Write a protein that binds this ligand. Structure first.
Ligand SMILES: COc1ccc(CCC(=O)O)cc1C
Length: 139
């Protein structure tokens, strides 16, 4: 019943809009996303809402492709069904200033890193040798 303190993660909180994407189709291909899903997913310019309440972080994506929402505690594995409909086991940790999100499914793994750079939030999606960089701006 008191007002809690802030945290470093507060740099991520807010409302973000996708402004650029690079190599996302190739990332999705490497992940195993099929043709029609890649085409539709690649058009979307989501709004991402990041919030924190105590130890719980929520990342919501409001998207013309597929809305998603995850809530989690750093270091604590959870179930996630991804925008492309994978059922994955995810763990998100804060490593320095970078949120590191590892998704595991069917013996595969991909990592999504989120970092503040100037006024942007940069999202770096890595499947094996293939990286996609997605830049969000404040909405
Ligand atoms: C493999 O497919 C994927 C993977 C990651 C995302 C989220 C990318 C972002 O938050 O900007 C979205 C999709 C469709």
């Amino acid at each position: 019943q008191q007002m809690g303190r802030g945290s470093m993660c507060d740099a991520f909180v807010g409302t973000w809009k996708l402004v650029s994407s690079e190599n996302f189709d190739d990332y999705m291909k490497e992940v195993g996303v099929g043709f029609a899903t890649r085409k539709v997913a690649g058009m979307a310019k989501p709004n991402m809402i990041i919030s924190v309440n105590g130890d719980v972080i929520t990342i919501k994506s409001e998207s013309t492709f597929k809305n998603t929402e995850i809530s989690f505690i750093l270091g604590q594995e959870f179930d996630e069904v991804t925008a492309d409909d994978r059922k994955v086991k995810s763990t998100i940790t804060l490593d320095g200033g970078v949120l590191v999100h590892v998704q595991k499914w069917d013996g595969k793994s991909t990592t999504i890193k989120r970092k503040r750079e100037d006024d942007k939030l940069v999202v770096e999606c890595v499947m094996k040798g293939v990286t996609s960089t997605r830049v969000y701006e404040r909405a």
